[PDB]
Structures are given as C-alpha cells and as structure tokens.
Design a protein around this ligand. Structure first.
Ligand SMILES: NS(=O)(=O)CCNC(=O)/C(Cc1ccc(O)c(Br)c1)=N/O
Ligand SMILES: [Zn+2]
Length: 257
C-alpha cells in the first residue's frame, strides 16, 4: 500500500506507522558544521572479504541484493558499534534527475542516489528480533554522484533488465560488495530509524563522507526499473527516497576532523 507517490508517499506513512513522527527518525540533514568530531570513536571495520551474495530482487520499492547471513561472513564492527553486525542486504534510493535521489543530505545537498548496506546485531540472533531493539541494526550509507563509472557496480546494472517489475528476482552469486566502497571510511554517525515502513527506531546510521562516482548510463539503468508488477500500468521506479526528518534532540558525530 505504501509507496512514494502523491497518495501513498512519505507524507502518508504516519497513518499506518505512527512512529514516522517519532524522536529518532531517518534520514536527516547532516549539518557538517554542527557535527562534533568524536576522538573516541573506535576505528570502523568493514570486513567483506567472505561475503556470499545470493539473489537480486525488485521489491516494488527498491532493488536489493541479498547475502547469506547464517554465519559471520561479511560484517561491520567498530566505530560507534558495540559487537558484530552481519550484512543482510544492500539496496539503493535514487531520483528522476541527477540532483535528487539521496535520503540523507549534507548541508542540504542532495546526491543522485544513496546506497544502503543493511546489517543486524548478532547479539539478537536474527534480523527480526534485531528490528525490535534500539541497537538492532546498522546501516552503512554511501552517496552516489554522477561522473565517472563505478566498475564494481556494473554487474548490478547489467542484471536490472531481468528484474524490471515488482516481485521479480534472479540469481546473483559471487558479487563483491567491496567494489562499491569509496577510498575513505570517514563517516558521520547518529541514532535513527529505517527510512521505509515500518520505520523502526533501531538503526545506528553510519554515513560515509566520500561519495562514489557512477556514470549517467549506470543511474539511467536504475531509472528503467518499475514500481509496478508485470501487467500493471508502467510507473518508473524513480524518486524512491524519504526526505530529511526532524533531528529532534540528536547529535551527529564525525569520525574525522
Ligand atoms: N532504507 S533502510 O533504512 O536501509 C531500510 C530498507 N527497508 C527494507 O529493506 C524494508 C523494510 C524492512 C522489513 C523488514 C526488515 O527486517 C528490514 Br531490516 C526492513 N523493505 O520492505
Ligand atoms: Zn534504504
């Protein structure tokens, strides 16, 4: 029922999910001049060498690549995090034009798209239990700007034809998420929420300062996806982003000076 259109989009979500007006909602605008460098943040550890991708899926809101999270293969540790968080899936949010598409903004700047690598805290045993905790999830957010092509994204782009419409999936094994990361792991962090229903307030956000560059041709292939299922009126999957939400009492911390 929920979506991104005029009658079902983010301004409607609070009716089914009243937490949409909560105290720790995401995304937010990252005011880079208000964020506090925190010299005590431990270093961030992104350990993706043993990642096992499984499937790529159009879920009617984004497309996602799913991973085997039955053991500690691809994990995020350190930084603001206590313990070990396992990679479950990544997906993207993007625009109809290159000047919008990201969920987080940086000094009000929107990027063309935003990559989310979703992880769950292993002390809670499964993602469903993790979803119910205030420290259950950690999402690594990476901005995309249009310029040079990202070679490590091309295998993803090339399979999107096969998952055009909601409900379609394909095998997507041996994909290496390391190829999606920028050079620097400098980041901002704050406590927030899922940016889609059910908008659960259980996410530690880690948003990288350095965007990755992707080509116009790569983002154009995202915009050929459809929100609708096969047979229904064609509605391009574009502008699948929630806008910035109130910061409320929160502090954004920077890992860098
Ligand atoms: N933009 S985001 O904050 O990274 C969250 C993206 N949301 C999704 O993938 C969802 C909702 C969801 C349902 C069950 C879950 O266990 C998790 Br986890 C997320 N799709 O239906
Ligand atoms: Zn997301």
């Amino acid at each position: 029922h929920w979506g991104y259109g005029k009658h079902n989009g983010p301004e409607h979500w609070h009716k089914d999910f009243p937490i949409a007006k909560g105290e720790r909602q995401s995304p937010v605008d990252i005011d880079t001049h208000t964020a506090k460098y925190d010299p005590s943040l431990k270093p961030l550890s992104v350990s993706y060498d043993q990642a096992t991708s499984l499937r790529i899926l159009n879920n009617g809101h984004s497309f996602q690549v799913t991973f085997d999270d039955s053991q500690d293969k691809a994990v995020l540790k350190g930084g603001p995090l206590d313990g070990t968080y396992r990679l479950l899936q990544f997906h993207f949010h993007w625009g109809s034009l290159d000047g919008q598409g990201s969920e987080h903004t940086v000094d009000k700047k929107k990027y063309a798209a935003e990559l989310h690598l979703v992880h769950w805290n292993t002390k809670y045993g499964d993602v469903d239990k993790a979803l119910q905790q205030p420290d259950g999830l950690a999402v690594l957010g990476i901005f995309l700007k249009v310029g040079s092509a990202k070679p490590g994204l091309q295998k993803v782009v090339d399979v999107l034809d096969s998952i055009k419409t909601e409900g379609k999936s394909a095998d997507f094994t041996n994909f290496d998420p390391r190829g999606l990361l920028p050079e620097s792991l400098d980041y901002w962090t704050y406590p927030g929420s899922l940016t889609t229903p059910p908008l659960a307030e259980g996410v530690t956000w880690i948003v990288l300062k350095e965007p990755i560059s992707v080509s116009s041709e790569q983002v154009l292939k995202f915009r050929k996806l459809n929100f609708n299922g096969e047979g229904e009126p064609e509605e391009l999957m574009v502008d699948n982003w929630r806008p910035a939400q109130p910061l409320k009492n929160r502090q954004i911390k920077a890992s860098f000076k």
